[PDB]
Amino acid sequence: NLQAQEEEREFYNARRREHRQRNDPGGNNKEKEVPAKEKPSFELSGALLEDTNTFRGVVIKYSEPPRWRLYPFKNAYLLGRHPIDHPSCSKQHAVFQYRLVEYTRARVKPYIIDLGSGNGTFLNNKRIEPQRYYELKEKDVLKFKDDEDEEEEEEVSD
Amino acid sequence: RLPPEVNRILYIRNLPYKITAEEMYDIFGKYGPIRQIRVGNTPETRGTAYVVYEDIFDAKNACDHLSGFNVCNRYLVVLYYNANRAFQKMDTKKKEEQLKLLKEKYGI
Amino acid sequence: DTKLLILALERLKEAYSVKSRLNQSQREELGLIEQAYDNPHEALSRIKRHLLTQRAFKEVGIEFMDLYSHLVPVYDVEPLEKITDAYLDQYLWYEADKRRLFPPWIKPADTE
Amino acid sequence: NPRTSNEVQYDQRLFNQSKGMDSGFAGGEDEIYNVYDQAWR
Amino acid sequence: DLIFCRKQAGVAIGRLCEKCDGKCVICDSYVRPCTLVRICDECNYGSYQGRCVICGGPGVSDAYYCKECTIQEKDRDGCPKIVNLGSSK
Amino acid sequence: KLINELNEREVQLGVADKVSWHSEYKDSAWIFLGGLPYELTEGDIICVFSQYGEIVNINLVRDKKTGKSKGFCFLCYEDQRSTILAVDNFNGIKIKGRTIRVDHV
Amino acid sequence: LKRQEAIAQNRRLTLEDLEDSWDRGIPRINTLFQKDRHTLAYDKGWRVRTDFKQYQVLKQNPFWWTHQRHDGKLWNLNNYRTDMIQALGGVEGILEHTLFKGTYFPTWEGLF
Amino acid sequence: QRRKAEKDSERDELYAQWGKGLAQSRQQQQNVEDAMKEMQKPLARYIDDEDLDRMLRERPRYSGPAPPPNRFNIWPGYRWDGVDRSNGFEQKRFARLASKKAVEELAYKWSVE
Amino acid sequence: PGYHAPVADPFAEHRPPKIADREDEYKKHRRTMIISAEKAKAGELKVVNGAAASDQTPGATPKKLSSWDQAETPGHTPSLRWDETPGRAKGSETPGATPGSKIWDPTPSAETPRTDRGGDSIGETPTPGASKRKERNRPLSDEELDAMFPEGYKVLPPPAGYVPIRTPARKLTATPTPLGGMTGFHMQTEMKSVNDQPSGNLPFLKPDDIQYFDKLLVDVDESEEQKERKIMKLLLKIKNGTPPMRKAALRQITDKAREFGAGPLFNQILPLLMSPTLEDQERHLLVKVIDRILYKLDDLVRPYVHKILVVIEPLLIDEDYYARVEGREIISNLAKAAGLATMISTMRPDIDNMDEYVRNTTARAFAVVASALGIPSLLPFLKAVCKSKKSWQARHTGIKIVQQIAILMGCAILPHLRSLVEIIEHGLVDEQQKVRTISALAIAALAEAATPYGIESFDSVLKPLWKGIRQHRGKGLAAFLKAIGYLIPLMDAEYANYYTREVMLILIREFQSPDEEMKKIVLKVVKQCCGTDGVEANYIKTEILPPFFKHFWQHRMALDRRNYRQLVDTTVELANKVGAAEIISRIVDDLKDEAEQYRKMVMETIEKIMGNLGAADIDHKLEEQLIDGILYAFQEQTTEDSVMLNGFGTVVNALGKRVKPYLPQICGTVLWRLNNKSAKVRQQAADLISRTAVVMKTCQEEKLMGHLGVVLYEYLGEEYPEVLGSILGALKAIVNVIGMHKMTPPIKDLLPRLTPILKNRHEKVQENCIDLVGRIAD
Ligand SMILES: [Zn+2]
Ligand SMILES: [Zn+2]
Ligand SMILES: [Zn+2]
């Protein structure tokens, strides 16, 4: 009377479901219903590129603050290790899926969401817990012992 | 979410006879990495070119935005290039060495 | 392009919509417009060819509609140039509205 | 993976009812009639 | 594209549809129906039972030869059921 | 595959409802999903087919000894119009690369 | 407002919540839902072309000012017919002027 | 053998009542209530009380997003995957039926001429 | 405005009304097709060694050995055929050494083509394997790059630096898309080259077809082969243009066949007939030019045969019928045009091809070529194939070939039926399933074309089949039932008594399966088994009819086409045995059923039944339900069709004068319907009169002839032609019953009233009118 029947049942997800529904591999963090690109939300704001709101990225290598590039957020983005992830990162500590940055509507607002990367991620050198959208404000800082880099956000003005 | 007939190769026409591959690589290089590009050097085919990308969706965004796009005085003819047709000029062979390699290295 | 050509062709078809037996020239017009539906790209290329080249057109008929007060001029063109010109017009107005050519104070306007 | 889109936009039952383009109603010919939209009985 | 099958003539009676009804087969004429048509069941079978010798519809009548083809003895050759040079169906 | 062409002869000819061949049954909820992928399980197919209704109970045929699916399931909803909707709708569907089949029982 | 509430609900709008205004408004809101709406979005200046149709076409358009495809149908006279028949004394009222009782038809409900 | 044959037989009652359409059965049940209305309400008009409250207002159920319209208008179940998996025959069938309504009218417009 | 802009093809409506895509997801793989004596046993070990040397192909070997069953007959022909199969060079070597050892032993008592398929399957195993170990987007090589594009193009680097931009482009497709960018325009005042196809005329080019016809666009002219390809654009004149241009062009290219040769033509055609955008008409026309040029070229086409068939075989499987008869025709002309060995040696590698599509359409191809060159010539090939020990897919193909030969050749299979059976029999017992299924199916097709003869040729096949009938679940079972079904009419009523009585059980049990394949099979079966003269009525009446009308008569069936027809036939035959009043009596109540198609079905069924058996069997009450049923069904007609009308007419003419009490109801309905709403039903009620004339005559109701006479006389002013025609027809039929001098509308009235109608243009009027003027004038 240890195991009555050797099989029984499941009532559980299937790999081909979640697989086929998200593929670049299969990915996590499917965009929520709100997500919309920032430029068209600057079109509903009636804003030409002069007065438009564009989020540019700024890089500083964590050891040396002394641009490897500069990155626009306007064109969500998948922050990951490198091929799957769009925002590839050379950092060797980033899990194959590290985090994601999604612009959402609450207004067009930027959001950062951790995917539960094994190491974590520090915000203004202060980490956030996994699995919730955390709004970012301009000049805030991101870094992916395991931090080789830094990042900053800027709206386009002046 | 794509029509099947489109392919990684695009036939491009309405080109000048002076045109430079610098402008070519620059312009076409927007959408993705170039697999390579050919240009007719022959009396009839001068003025025509073929572009091939590492990915199809590259070419899709290309023909999307590059549709009737302009160079000099000209609006380039941008079409998705066909398949098969004249092929057998080359052969099927040289599979033996590479297949022997993948059968050797990974052992599978 | 297909959008525009379609609109213009419908517009031309609208004058004859009641369609009694009409006449010969009108018959040519219906048959030619009808042709334009089956093979649109042909018609568009022929049109752009005219627009790039021909500077000499055929004679226009003229007649007066009688309002019993002031007469109204009425012009008659060969069908080919009517389809060509029609597409030319839908296109011109379309680009014009897109580019905000006409300031708001000109008001036989689509909005109101 | 849900299939998501910005906003909502509109349903379907209606989103395709009335004809298209069609244009008004003849140059404005007398012969047309057409005053009433639905039959009597 | 369209030519006779010319298999051996059997005892099966010919069958013409509405359209072909009056025609003598070879002379293409309506004149002087006299003798009767015979084609092999290889040409006439199954879905071809009561089928037209020509178009492939149901036979409403039987073909009669003219007197012209009679004296020239053409009615005695292979079964005059036209086959298209694809299949017969 | 034959179903979809029966729905096209039913729509094309203007069948107009109640003479519909879903009125063939009126007595039956349970539906037949054949040609299913072997990796699938109860909770899954429940999650996909609770779309068009509320499924009360489904018995998926899984070989008794090995304990793996034979590739098809007999399902039971709470509502018939859910069955009519499901056969007439969810059929000819791709799952994991293979097109499932559905029909009444 | 109905669009905004639909956005916040994420549920798209049905027919019924629009059944109130269905026939109302100068653009005649229902005209958004025209099947061919795409094509008409690319038509511009229609209202002026109607003004100049009087020169291209002999006949005289009274409706020149509007077009049902852009502006919808701006009136519904369906009532006028019913009230007309009522004022004449009903079906039995008008028919009382006719030969109808001659035809020996059981009813007029089937007159065709 | 009483309780066993009532396991199988009372399971014939269970899976018999379940078979058809549990959803269908309740709707049938509502009609039964309607008969009750008849006994007290032989020929109801207007202000009589059921009509009153009637016009005086004008178990997990699925939460997320929206469920595309179903001819029969049925909300999806509790744990439903939340994804549209369909042949689209509903819409097109849904759209086509609507198109016909336009067709009957533009058919008429013809008649007066 | 922005809100109406938030609310922001018809040519794609009318243009798609021209031609169609027509096709499924299964067929579109077309688009992926790129252009092109015990020492005779030990001696079979010897030949296996030598040919294996010159590896492992079973087919050619069994083809070689396949000449042994004629022994001492075999001759130089074996050198010819094999000449194509292996290299024609080694061909003289092997065949020569074979005749030497053969004659001696008696006294004392393309490779590249196949090499490609092996590599193709091996790469399939490599990739498939890797995922387990772990499409068109797979990276490519410069030889593969040189493989696609045609002659005369150069590869360029502009820089090494711009190339490094192309390499960083991938990384920068992510990186530089996330960076500063935008475009703008300035207001400034402003050459425009372009090409249509000018010369004199050159009928127009679709925007895509440029890719093909671009060489014609350039105007460089008048300076060899390049001028033959250049002048070969007369194709364009065939594809698009005015009908006269197509005609004259077509002839001009016909007479230039021998000149230009098949190579340049097919090189410039097969791309077009391969075009993804191809029309219906354009397709058909290119098919025409391929025919007309293949009436001439004979020995020339040998290299291109496969290169043809690859495009053509998709014509055999098609929704269009005329497309199919054309395809069979042109493959007939090709195979007969080329040589047998050309066809055989050509088409082998498609047998084991991974996709089953090419295998199938290839099977129908062998069917066509076998119709061309005859069964006995091609036999040893097949008989070699079905015994191939490599893999099953081959045998599956070859068996399918046996089938499609059965369908195509049909009645003419008869002579070689025995040998064919002797081939196929070994697959019924095979371990694989498909081979068994398709096998027994092929037996079915045979027997169906074998209609009764050659029973003993099927003989050895039976005993396994019957046994299988016991143990099978699923489709294979039904298939066996199909075979046995077509067999039973060919047996003896004594043996078939027993065997039949055995089949009836399973036949009963299997009515209920949801499979529609099942229901088709078991249906036609019930026809043949129960339509046997050696079967007893009462047994059918009890055992069969109640389940038959229960499960089979439902609204799933009738909506389908084939199921509709076959159902009609089977029911007709059951009536042919058990009698009339039974069947009809059970199906009358369904005349009043809602749906049309169902009513149509039972209506035509009643029609055929009362056509054959005669109305004499019918009793009284059921006859009341009859006439009422037929009127009722006839009163609601959604579409115009004969079935209801011919149905009514046959019913009445069959009832004879038993119908007399029913006339006033009939003709009352006939007049009231004879008004209704015009164009739909007038013509139909009229025709109803036309076919009911004689019945309204012989029973001697004269008032009714007055009615129809002057009433119909009045409609001759009807403006709708399609009605008026039916009216005149009705008058015609009334003239053939009541005579000249008794016409209630005396001819003096009628005929001049007819005279002006002859202007009427539209057809049916002219037809019936002239006819009637003929009857009266005669
Ligand atoms: Zn024959
Ligand atoms: Zn005929
Ligand atoms: Zn003759």
Author numbering:
A (entry chain X): 171 to 194, 209 to 250, 258 to 266, 280 to 286, 293 to 316, 323 to 360, 382 to 395
B (entry chain 5): 12 to 119
C (entry chain A): 835 to 946
D (entry chain R): 402 to 442
E (entry chain 6): 7 to 95
F (entry chain Y): 8 to 112
G (entry chain A): 1391 to 1502
H (entry chain Z): 480 to 537, 563 to 617
Reported in the publication:
Pre-mRNA splicing is executed by a dynamic ribonucleoprotein complex known as the spliceosome. RNP remodeling of the B complex by the RNA-dependent ATPase/helicase Brr2 results in the dissociation of U1 and U4 snRNPs and the recruitment of about 20 protein components, forming the activated spliceosome (Bact complex). Conversion of the Bact complex into the catalytically activated B* complex by the ATPase/helicase Prp2 allows the branching reaction to occur, generating a 5′-exon and an intron lariat-3′-exon intermediate. In this manuscript, we report the cryo-EM structures of the human Bact complex in three distinct compositional and conformational states at resolutions of 4.9, 5.1, and 6.5 Å.
A follow-up 3D classification with a soft mask in the RNF113A region led to the identification of two major conformational states at average resolutions of 5.1 Å and 6.5 Å on the basis of the FSC value 0.143. As will be detailed later, the 5.1-Å and 6.5-Å reconstructions represent the mature and late human Bact complexes, respectively. Compared to the mature Bact complex, the late Bact complex no longer contains the splicing factors RNF113A (Cwc24 in yeast) and NY-CO-10 (Cwc27 in yeast). This structural finding is consistent with the biochemical observation that these two proteins only transiently associate with the spliceosome and are released during the Bact-to-B* transition. Because RNF113A directly protects the 5′-end guanine base of the 5′SS, its release may signal the beginning phase of the Bact-to-B* transition. Therefore, the late Bact complex likely represents the state of the spliceosome just preceding its transition to the B* complex through the action of Prp2. Intriguingly, the N-terminus of RNF113A is buried in the cleft between the endonuclease-like domain and the N-domain of Prp8; therefore the release of RNF113A requires conformational changes in Prp8, which is confirmed in the late Bact complex. With the dissociation of RNF113A and NY-CO-10 in the late Bact complex, the RNaseH-like domain and Bud13 have been dislocated, and the endonuclease-like domain of Prp8 also undergoes a 45° rotation. In the third step, the splicing factors RNF113A and NY-CO-10 are released, leading to the late Bact complex.
